[PDB]
Symmetry: D2
């Protein structure tokens, strides 16, 4: 299937192939003068992928309000039709992460619907941070770390169910993020709470296929505003080290304390082989979940700088699971995921342009200036031509968001899907 | 009328009377040694009030979920009943802060309900951060500073409506907080948006009654995640200075950047007569909206230190409006509000024990240590006996939450309000 | 007796009647809550925190340093001042030394300590500033410097600190370094850490059987982009890699804005890697302000974790308590005196927590009463206990006051010359 | 000429050919975008940023300082080093002096400056550290000190700074103080601020008609609890209270974590009180790192505000640009060279922003395209424009590379004595 009319793609691409040729040829000539074959970079770029969050093709909100756009996806199947667009146009998101029970549906259908749309399935995402209809036990005071054995068991039961559904759709991992924490001093005993969590997580580990991975994800706060059981990579690490070889750490860029050097944390987890994967997005204040690289692009480059360095240093057995974890509250969800996904590839490409040998040289002789400049020369290089050409050759659009608006897709699904109503967000009932 | 049976309050008070006498008298003995009449403090304490927020009477939540308890208030009228409990037991919340359209109801009836319940109404809170049913223009991209004239006109009109309702219930102020901002660089033109906002607030100021005040409330972020038109007290001051004398700044404790010295911002505003009021709550990470004092009680005391100091220095016409802006996601909203209110009186109480003569002296001699230590001798004093005696003398409960749970009130309203 | 016994006496007498009233009032009040003020005072009496030798002198910032009168000229002077603090508070029997700032003949240090009734806490190495003669500079690092020769020299200095430590009775080595980078790309994170790990292992080898090696993390400063030991997570990896004797030292002001510090303490305790603390208060960065002066509640919440571990019966849990501060605008001695009191104050209040009730409210997810349970403890003015504790052990009911009355500062001011160049 | 003309020429001819390729490529790409590359280059050529006399010397922290070789000592060595920066970058024709640090005979300063091809930017008073002989200490504050005489001394010093300034061609006086407190209660916030506003009025009077007075805010350091001029809010209160000649100065690293700095800029511009900037970068606090070495996009966003100010043709908008960094682990010159380069880059890119389309996407609340419109400019490698601008004005294609080729560091190292060989 083709969510976008192939003629629209070819059309809009042809309307740009002229400029693209110039820019590309000019950049390839520059990189050439720098001992780099723009063709090897491009080659690698077309093969780099990140997963799109199913809960991301819909409009997000805040506790204060939600302002839905038009043609909002009604369910998981609609959401899949949308991601198919992002993939067709960028060729960088051939996989979708699901959230249960949100995208709960007949596995045969999901798998079937994806095969038609040319989409696969990334890591399963359990949900014990909200109560579903008929749920016997509330998650108000926690889930996997709740003081009630029955509630923890139910929480464990859910994650287990998530693994079955994923096993059936082709998923190879389970990411566990919970809001388990406390809003007040004394409310929780940090130790007992964690101990409970570790044990509960241990039972989930048993139900993990032999070729699967369990990813735990840390966050400093929200929904818990005083303490969070899985608050930082430190704790996260302790979890991965305890659970077993199949348990790794998930790093969501916007979940760190103000000014945290996030790229070091990536390196530390890589060092001890516990970097399960990422959750790309950007922010300025807290867990803002903004478009990848929209606020701090250099930071995103520095995170990939560690990733490429490991990739280059022959770090055997290093295939992190990349995913986009964003909330689009004031833009078309599709356009954002499209560009956020491209910004990720931009960062990657620039990281592949760094003179690794020259860098080591400067690090070794403590030449701080040239070291940081060595990185900058790569970051400064406008890799758009490479990202564009990569898309074109793989059958994507030279200019993704442009082709999309020209295809009219939004007005289209908008005419097929019911109208959404703007409402509160959760600060009150 | 009394939401809580008077016989239960009396019972629960006699039960603790003996102890309170012991503690109060020991405290009086201690304070007299420090040359402080415990009586004069109790006298001022039972006169300190702070209004409860209607939107805090029910369980709040986050963008990730909302976990309601039992007997949640069905509407504004339910909320007023629960606010009546809070006032009956603490005698510190004789007023309620409403939000329109959230609490929209017939002014005449709200007024009626309030009078019967012994409650009054504090500043009105306009709501142009969310779309009301039927609304012509969406506030998705802003309100008072929206690029589209029609949307700004609609925003202005909403606030003017808010003024009409409040005039009707005995309210004398309009607090304006908006989420206007941008989530991306370039998405907005900082100055132009601000210019629009000022122009829009100017119109509201124009329709403001002359026995009313206009409070603007700054916030660093949320809902906007890159820029916010009214981001800090700097922008806020510009705003109030421009609008006129009836427009002041409202300080919400959790709306500041990390490590910000908030008490200083409070002094500065008083110095330039632009401190309209507070939105009390506590926090640790962002605008957490936690019970006041539950995270940083000392920070709360320092804010009150500036309030009590202003009165000491002689500042005139300073009567900031005290309000509680909290969200209670995992506790009985009512019990939370009860202690938050008490905690606020606690900070005020201790700030009144500060020997200003001694303090001033150490400041002049640059004796930093004795200076800081002078504040600490006040803050370290357990003033609970004074807070309890004050409630006891004014019809309240020695142990508010204790008497509340003994009333089984929550079980009662949970039966009257199917879930 | 650095302070005349009659001064201490006279001053205690003048305040005896009030201490009696407040103490007995607090005793009654506490008795009503099922707490033995007596049992608390007795425990408070035995809570000791080590004073840093480098804190008894006026500290400064990169912009300036405003010394006071009577600044100590050397380690022996500092010890004399440390004895003033211990005599009056009775909460600081030990002193933490810094090599090479305090380097001196171990036998004289030991003798001056014994004579003053002072012992020596953990030894602190210094490879964050060059010393004269140094064959290699620590500009670009020390234990993790790219140059092996530089790392060797850092390792040697640490072993040397151990030797000095053994002679004066010390039982641990604390290692804090500025090693890091100010520019992205300057250092290869992983490689700099492997180097450090390799260097620390060697130091570990030189540890006595009854010694411990403490690694202290810090988010930034002097490194402004990356610090090798940046947070408790990296710190944990170090403790776990080096061995049983290796633990983590937590300095309150070394964390990112808003970091829940008490949790980290809880985490290290659970995994047996809580070596000790460096107490001090802060508001913006590693301010090193007097403990409890800014956030007294946070201090109490850290101690709540400390007292709870005891309550859970964690075995082999004996963390090293030390005060790590800089006093830039007060009399170093007066600040350390009160900082010591604030900590005993936090500790005291932690002991007043009705944990049986706390455990109840926690299990019942009664968040409000839970938090309220801690507050009942924290809101108690424990000063009478701290003062009575001092009296019974020969300290001053009002330390700073007795110190001012003794004219000590003025005395040492007339005895010590100010540094001119 | 500090650096040899044949070296510059040599290094430039060496890179001139490839520069041509890149430059013509950008002019091409910028043409298909509707931009005249030669228009940008002409403006870039005239973008100047003052160089701090204290920046040419290796910086340090409260823990240590590792001076490099050939350290300039005394204002004269310093001017000689700043001259290297101006010659190779051509973007720093003027120097900011700090009194008393660079105190000397005005006539000789002015004389030495013309000899080197340097002017003198705003004067910088210093009442945050005590100088030898000083009657009163600034330990507890200067312009806001509680002691009248201490404040008179500060006023007078600043006034002296204006006189030194008038004699060398300076037109403004920047006033940054450490004044604040480290403990709650120590200072009475309002009273201290009143004493400061009163003293500042005194200085204001000494300002010539064309002279301006810049006050600089800082969240913390050296004060660790509260600072008199803590934020831009207080700053504004000061500038609008002292008068038309007094404006606010904004040092990028003096803001609370996560603060939106470019917005503060806008707000001040709109109100005619943006006196100028102090460029540098940070990640934690006032790290005072090389501009754009940490968050280059933020530098651009600040500059996007500065450039838009030109277009909207704003009034009273004439910001004094100064670099205020501290180089602790690199050659002070090389750093200042690339910092001044990074600043021009920001400017160059902000200048490529299609204001028309931007404003278009703003009114339509088309946020994604709006942000993408900024990304199109910022994403453009404007180095070819930077090098070309340098080449046309007598600068070097690759400043640091030419600097290194000139072997200048080694030269001054041989002329100036270190502390140790
Ligand atoms: O904040 C929550 C984390 O980003 C999790 O990955 C979460 O599952 C995601 O936001 C979708 O719910
Ligand atoms: O962040 C919101 C501010 O605190 C406002 O006062 C708001 O109206 C209040 O929180 C109600 O939601
Ligand atoms: O920030 C530095 C840490 O406090 C270290 O413990 C340091 O060695 C101490 O301050 C003494 O210099
Ligand atoms: O003294 C160095 C500089 O650093 C300070 O933080 C301020 O930026 C001020 O400009 C001062 O002159
Ligand atoms: Mn995530
Ligand atoms: Mn940042
Ligand atoms: Mn998130
Ligand atoms: Mn508020
Ligand atoms: Mn804090
Ligand atoms: Mn709020
Ligand atoms: Mn320390
Ligand atoms: Mn420290
Ligand atoms: Mn500056
Ligand atoms: Mn600075």
């Amino acid at each position: 299937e083709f969510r976008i009319a192939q003629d629209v793609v070819a059309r809009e691409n042809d309307r740009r192939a002229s400029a693209l040729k110039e820019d590309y040829e000019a950049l390839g000539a520059n990189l050439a003068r720098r001992g780099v074959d723009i063709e090897a970079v491009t080659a690698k770029v077309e093969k780099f992928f990140v997963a799109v969050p199913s809960w991301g093709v819909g409009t997000g909100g805040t506790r204060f309000a939600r302002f839905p756009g038009t043609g909002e996806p009604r369910g998981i199947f609609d959401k899949l039709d949308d991601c198919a667009v992002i993939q067709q146009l960028t060729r960088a998101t051939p996989n979708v992460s699901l959230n249960i029970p949100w995208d709960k549906a007949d596995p045969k259908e999901l798998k079937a619907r994806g095969d038609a749309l040319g989409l696969g399935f990334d890591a399963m995402n359990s949900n014990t941070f909200s109560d579903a209809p008929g749920q016997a036990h509330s998650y108000k005071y926690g889930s996997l770390s709740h003081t009630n054995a029955a509630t923890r068991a139910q929480a464990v039961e859910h994650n287990l169910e998530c693994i079955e559904i994923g096993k059936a759709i082709g998923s190879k991992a389970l990411t566990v993020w919970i809001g388990d924490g406390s809003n007040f001093p004394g409310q929780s005993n940090f130790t007992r709470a964690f101990e409970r969590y570790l044990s509960a997580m241990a039972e989930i580990y048993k139900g993990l296929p032999d070729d699967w991975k369990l990813f735990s994800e840390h966050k400093m706060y929200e929904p818990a505003f005083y303490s969070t059981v899985v608050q930082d990579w430190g704790t996260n690490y302790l979890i991965a080290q305890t659970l077993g070889p199949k348990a790794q750490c998930l790093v969501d860029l916007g979940h760190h304390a103000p000014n945290t050097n996030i790229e070091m944390i990536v390196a530390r987890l890589i060092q001890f082989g516990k970097l399960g994967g990422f959750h790309f997005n950007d922010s300025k204040y807290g867990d803002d979940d903004l478009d990848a690289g929209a606020i701090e692009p250099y930071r995103l480059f520095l995170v990939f700088n560690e990733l490429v360095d490991a990739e280059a240093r022959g770090v055997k057995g290093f295939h992190p699971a990349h995913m986009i974890d964003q909330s689009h509250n004031v833009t078309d969800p599709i356009e954002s995921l499209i560009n956020s996904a491209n910004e990720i590839r931009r960062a990657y490409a620039q990281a592949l342009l760094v003179d690794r040998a020259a860098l080591s040289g400067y690090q070794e002789d403590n030449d701080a200036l040239m070291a940081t400049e060595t990185l900058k020369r790569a970051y400064r290089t406008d890799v758009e031509p490479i990202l564009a050409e990569a898309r074109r050759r793989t059958g994507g659009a030279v200019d993704p968001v442009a082709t999309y608006r020209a295809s009219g897709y939004r007005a289209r699904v908008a005419a097929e899907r019911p109208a959404s109503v703007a409402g509160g967000g959760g600060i009150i009932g």
